[PDB]
Each structure stands twice: as C-alpha cells, then as structure tokens.
Subunit: 114 residues, 4 copies
C-alpha cells in the first residue's frame, strides 16, 4: 500500500541507494520506527509494508537526501526531506510518495489510487 520514489533533477535519473525511513506517530506523539530501506536502481522502494500493518494514522517518510548529494560530491542545503501525512481508509488504497531532488530544493507529491 506504500511506495516511495526518488528522482534526481541534476542528473536526470532515478536517485539510487537513497536511505528512506518511515515512522508512525504513537499515542504519546513520538515517532516510532515503522519501515525502512534503500531505493533501487529505478529510484523506487517497494515492499515497505503490508495492508494489514498499514493502519490509519499519521506517518512520516524521511529521505536521507544529504548522504545522497554528498556521495555525488555535491554540497546540499537540507539535512533530509520529510513527508508527513495521514493515511485514511476512506480515500484510495495505494499511496506513492514521490520526491524530486536538487541540492537546494525538493518537490514532493502524493499519488493515491484504488
């Protein structure tokens, strides 16, 4: 139900081997680790969770953009990119969180489908 895709606006390519961490907001308002992985050669990270585990709640997707740029020898602005959203069962069932990265900028969108 959740896929993350990361793209590079400098090289015009998928952003490969980017660390991504997903958190769920707990009842005490702390962020609890939920899922993580590294983007593939296509810039995508599949298999983070299952329908059963991905209950309604507030989730945070943290993308380690700083390490990505540093590996390329480029000095970046942001410590990371954070995407925070509510999963809602009323809405469609599959969520794609996409991020387009530049050293001093990023764009993110959600594609939510049934």
């Amino acid at each position: 139900p959740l896929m993350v895709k990361v793209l590079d606006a400098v090289r015009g390519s998928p952003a490969i081997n980017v660390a991504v961490h997903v958190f769920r907001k707990a009842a005490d308002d702390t962020w609890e680790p939920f899922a993580s992985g590294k983007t593939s050669e296509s810039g995508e990270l599949h298999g983070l969770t299952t329908e059963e585990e991905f209950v309604e709640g507030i989730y945070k997707v943290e993308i380690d953009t700083k390490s990505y740029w540093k590996a390329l020898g480029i000095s970046p602005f942001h410590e990371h990119a954070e995407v925070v959203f509510t999963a809602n069962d009323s809405g469609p069932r599959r969520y794609t969180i996409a991020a387009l990265l530049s050293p001093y900028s990023y764009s993110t969108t959600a594609v939510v489908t049934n």
Copy 2:
C-alpha cells in the same frame, strides 16, 4: 524510447485522458507532428515511437493542460505545458518526460536511463 507521464497535484492522482502531442523540429525550423495520444488511467502514455524513428533531434512535448482543468471545472492559468529538449545518442536511451500539474503551476523533469 519515449514515455510521458502526467500527475495531478490537486487531487493526488494520475492525470487521465490528457492529450499529448509530440513534434520534431524540421530543417526549416517549423515543428512537424511526430506522435500523439492521451494519457492512460495510470497517467502514462506509452507507445509514442520506436527506436528506429526516434533519431537525434529537437523535440517538443505539448501537454493539453487547459482542457484537463476545464473538464474538472477548474479555471487554469496556462494554455498548455510545453517541454522542449534535444535527444542525443551519446546519452542514455530511454526518456521519461514527467509533468506535475496544478491550476497555476507545473513542474517537469526528465528521467533518462540505459
């Protein structure tokens, strides 16, 4: 070698049934029709061309954003969105032109892979 994908930033969805026209620049600098189609339910338009036909050159991808917004009952800013680029054989072989649409804004990127 060429795919076009269009996304909607207002609804968080693929932009479905969007007309897309591709042109190649001719030797007299006019734009000659090359390929066209309508995005699918996934927001993607596949099958525009073949490796044989897609020779080095300057290409224009025109996306009929105004009709898309009007069909949704939303007043848009742009007449259309234009993406103009050189296809170069030195670079990687497959080109994805992606566009993220809002009524008064759009973002575009190229994902170019081998």
Copy 3:
C-alpha cells in the same frame, strides 16, 4: 537573515495567513522553539529573528499547510511542510525559504546570500 515566502499554486496567489514555526536543535538533540509568525498579504514572513540571535545550528522551518488548506474549506494530503537545514556554519548568511503549495504536493527551495 531569515525570511519565509509561501505561494498558492491553485489560486495563483500569495498564501496569506500561513502559520510558520521555527525550531533549533538543542544540545540534548531536542527541537527548541526559536521563532514563529504568519505570512502577510504578500505571502512573506519577515522579522522572525536578528543576526545576533540566529547563531550556527540546525533549524527546522515548519509551515502549517494543512491549517491553510482546511480554512479554504479544503482537505489536503500533508500535515505540514518542514524544511531542515544547517545555518550560519561558515558565518552569517541570509536565508529565504520559499514554498509553493498544492493540496497533494509542495515544492520548496532556499536562496542563500552572503551579506
């Protein structure tokens, strides 16, 4: 030395009355409140800090996009937009944090100048 500008990609307008909260990472790795305000009729928020107060550190600029969209009677995707960055680590700079908002998307950029 810190300005925040917010635009609305649906209306083609400044995003007015957007709440913005800035935090600085403390010695104990917690986010300490640093400054806050609301965007003006131009979509800009000036006067958050001074060059004396805006020392080296890791800062988080949280833009309350959800509250913005709800109030235009609209249900958006994100809770907020957060921008996290190290500032002033090579001496004082001036920072503009710009954000362009849609209900299911935002884009952010920084303009960093040396006075």
Copy 4:
C-alpha cells in the same frame, strides 16, 4: 504589470543574466516579439512592458535556460522553459512568472494580482 523571476536550485541563488523573450500571438496566429530582457542580480526582470502596451492576448514567456546552464559550463536537458497564458482578458492584472531551474527539471508558477 509583467515581472519574471528565475531561481537556481543547484546553487541556492537567484539565476542571474538569464535571457527572457516575450511574444504575443498576432491576428494571423504567429508569435510576434513583444519584449525581452535579462534577469538582474536578484533574479528578477522588471520593466518589460507598460499597462498601456500589455493589452489582452495570448503571451509566451520564453526563458533561455539552456544558455544559462551552458555558461556555468554545464550541459542541461531542456532547450528553454516556455510559459504560455492568456492575459488581461477580464481587465488589467499584474503577473509574476517565477521559474525554479535545475539541469534536468524546472518548475514554474504564476502570481496574478488585481491592482
């Protein structure tokens, strides 16, 4: 009534000395030159037109992004960024066309105000 602002997402800076050409669609459906200029050290291009001259029409703002990137010694994807829109069809408005540039991507937005 027409301003163009261009930012650089690689450098985190205004995009300076970017050439901008504006066209208006003529009665015969050709693009007629309307105005042109270069962005300043702030990334802004003011003074393109007057409210008298900037009548109703379909306008194209062409931003010469390729020439910008080449000159920073860099090979970019797009030939230019073009923004095409109807203007002043409900009377005079003020238009800001903003563009945020990367070598393989750009984003553009409009801010339209009623004076």
